[PDB]
């Protein structure tokens, strides 16, 4: 109330509320809304019941505050909340999200529009098992990927010659054709292309591929050749990956959807859009961006060997005086995979893993500036608790679970901002979208390269070009990289984020940019008796620093 509140009679305030909220604008004022207006009047007792403009204009402000929330046709106990919002309306605006909570959006080919999917966590029970995907999800996943790739191909400027479905190749021969589909091996052992219509075989003996790509099974390829009905051999004369698209032209086809929406979200009821605040946030980002710096480290920092702790202590000594905004630690934190212990005489693997993080809480006690001012990001590597416990340090499921809470009971208390996410994770800045993804790529694309019968800077060029043209984080089949049936949408590069953190221990560091996207390639944290970590300036500038 005011300094001299007066207890009102609700009947004599009822007409003033009802007229304004039921004839000009607003509707369906509840009793709790009336009580909220009553206490607000108690906060405006000055010459009230005789003061016209201020009360009505504050009611108009109430309308301008509560119209945007839902639809504003009821006012519950939250009336005090909108009163507090009035008082408060009289770096933030950035988010970090993992693959578990990413919004689900299906695709429909016959309507050429994305469709929001209700979350199983929010409407279902989920008490016993709500995370188990259903049977047909894996059936529809490759269909969705093919739909997106076909849409991208059709939207190309050059393509307005037309492609032909596989099944339409039966009755014609000795004629050239163009077609695309999944590339893989059949049950027999030959090379085949798959389409929703059907599948055919591939002839490779006279194929000239477009250089600059990693032609790997499981990748969409544009195939040009001549059909032969003598057998079933499609004699290919050239092969090329589909081209990519830039972020602005991708968004403009869907206006500006709130897929990674921080200001607003969509649901099953309606669809959402916004572009007025985008320029405002862009210009806000253009200032004091040098102050909001964020730094990442190398991959596979092991918390068992003394040298890593010494180098990390030196790095923290240099970083304590000038705390950055985000400090991201990536890679596995234990040099040995954890699994079931067959020996009861020695220290258990789980206990060793738990102790491997307790000492970190002690080392963070002498860097109160970094702890206080900078947030913490931790990303699991290849052989952390959940993965190595079944995969034994080998490759496994991509939507990796976060570090268990039972093993990180001291980092959350010593530090004020600690975040654990999946292996692929998303951060949403004011005008930037960045993803961080830790795995091995160079070896995977080197060993499984297709053989065509017939200075290190080019390998990363080919890798970036392939990963961007294909537009998927895991351009591999289900045999190599098993993926959860539903979460595959988190692995898709449909929104094509502005910057990607390609962490690869098998590739040299690089700062390439292409197709409107900028890619960074952090290396291993320690190499050849040196320690290295890299910081990125949000103004499209990079710095690399090392401490022996």
């Amino acid at each position: 109330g005011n300094v001299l509140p007066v207890k009102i009679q609700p009947p004599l305030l009822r007409p003033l509320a009802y007229r304004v909220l039921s004839r000009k604008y607003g509707l369906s004022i509840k009793s709790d809304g009336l009580s909220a207006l009553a206490e607000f009047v108690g906060t405006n007792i000055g010459a009230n019941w005789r003061q016209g403009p201020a009360t009505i204009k504050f009611l108009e402000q109430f309308a301008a505050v509560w119209k945007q929330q839902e639809r504003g046709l009821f006012i519950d106990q939250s009336g005090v909340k909108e009163v507090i919002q009035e008082m408060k309306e009289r770096r933030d605006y950035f988010k970090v999200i993992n693959a578990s909570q990413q919004q689900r959006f299906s695709y429909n080919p016959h309507k050429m529009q994305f469709i929001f999917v209700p979350n199983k966590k929010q409407n279902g029970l989920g008490g016993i098992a709500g995370f188990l995907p259903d049977i047909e999800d894996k059936v529809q996943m490759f269909l969705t990927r093919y739909y997106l790739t076909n849409d991208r191909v059709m939207r190309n400027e050059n393509f307005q010659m037309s492609i032909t479905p596989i099944k339409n190749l039966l009755g014609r021969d000795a004629q050239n054709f163009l077609l695309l589909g999944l590339l893989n091996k059949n049950f027999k052992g030959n090379w085949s292309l798959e389409d929703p219509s059907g599948s055919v075989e591939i002839d490779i003996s006279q194929t000239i591929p477009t250089q600059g790509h990693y032609y790997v099974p499981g990748c969409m390829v544009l195939v040009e050749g001549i059909y032969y009905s003598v057998g079933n051999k499609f004699h290919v004369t050239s092969m090329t990956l589909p081209p990519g698209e830039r972020r602005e032209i991708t968004l403009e086809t869907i206006g500006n959807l709130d897929l990674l929406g921080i200001h607003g979200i969509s649901n099953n009821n309606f669809i959402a859009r916004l572009d007025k605040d985008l320029k405002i946030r862009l210009h806000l980002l253009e200032k004091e961006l040098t102050d909001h710096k964020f730094v990442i480290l190398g991959a596979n920092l092991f918390l068992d060997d003394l040298k890593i702790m010494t180098a990390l202590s030196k790095i923290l000594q240099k970083l304590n005086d000038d705390p950055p905004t985000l400090l991201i630690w990536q890679g596995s934190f234990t040099s040995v995979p954890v699994f079931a212990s067959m020996s009861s005489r020695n220290i258990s693997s789980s206990t060793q893993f738990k102790n491997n993080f307790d000492a970190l809480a002690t080392l963070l006690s002498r860097f109160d500036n970094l702890t206080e001012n900078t947030t913490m990001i931790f990303i699991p590597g290849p052989n952390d608790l959940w993965g190595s416990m079944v995969s034994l340090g080998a490759s496994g499921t991509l939507p990796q679970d976060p570090i268990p809470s039972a093993f990180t009971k001291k980092i959350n208390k010593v530090c004020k901002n600690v975040v654990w996410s999946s292996n692929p994770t998303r951060i949403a800045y004011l005008s930037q979208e960045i993803v961080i993804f830790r795995d091995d790529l160079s070896g995977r694309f080197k060993r499984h390269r297709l053989e065509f019968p017939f200075q290190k800077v080019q390998e990363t060029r080919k890798l970036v070009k392939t990963i961007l043209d294909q537009g998927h984080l895991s351009p591999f089949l289900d045999s190599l990289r098993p993926i959860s049936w539903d979460l595959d949408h988190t692995l898709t590069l449909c929104p094509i984020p502005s910057t990607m953190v390609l962490c690869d221990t098998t590739s040299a560091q690089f700062d390439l940019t292409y197709n409107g996207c900028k890619v960074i390639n952090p290396g291993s944290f320690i190499h050849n008796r040196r320690a290295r970590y890299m910081e990125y300036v949000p103004s499209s500038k990079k710095t690399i620093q090392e401490e022996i």
């Binding site: 020996s343 005489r345 020695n346």
Partner: protein
Amino acid sequence: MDLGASVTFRSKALGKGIQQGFEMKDLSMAENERYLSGFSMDIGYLLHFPEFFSLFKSWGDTITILVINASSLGQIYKQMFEKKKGKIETYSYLVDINFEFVYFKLYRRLSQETTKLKEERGFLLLLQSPFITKLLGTIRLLNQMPIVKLSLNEVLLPQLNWQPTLLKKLVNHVLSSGSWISHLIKLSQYSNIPICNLRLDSMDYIIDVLYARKLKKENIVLWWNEKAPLPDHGG
């Protein structure tokens, strides 16, 4: 594996090879190992019970424990002395008696005691603690002598009357050290493995060594792997 514990020379340049490091791949051969050596040499004894750091000297006669006890220590020592008189007599030729008792800022004495032992004797260390590598890294002098490790971890306190049970533990370890070292000597002089690289529970190590050397004598790649519980297949 290839050289084993029984190594010898057939150079027929000893001074030049001893001032520098002597090369192996040109001169290498393993002699027989039916008997390793006639052991007569002092021992070391450093322990830790999660502040129960302990030390004892075979040739010394004093006991001090880091931060009723003395009488219990004496009576328990005498009691298990008569209990294992037979084992004591049989293994006296390996390790050989009453001694003083003491229960002592204080945590810097490990380095001083190790220095006193180092400049008083050359002697093999028996270490027992759940923090093997931590204690190895905290004391810089422990790296300059051969060490035989007897790691038996997972020791806890009953929150009450820990003194009698810890006295039992220490006394049985001390009076079974002779049997332990006899068993290790037997296993080493049978398996052609140096004494410091062996352990009572590391029975898989002997399997690995023998199988690997017999495959190396064959034409089969060992697929040997380290720090990873997977076979090596080339990536």
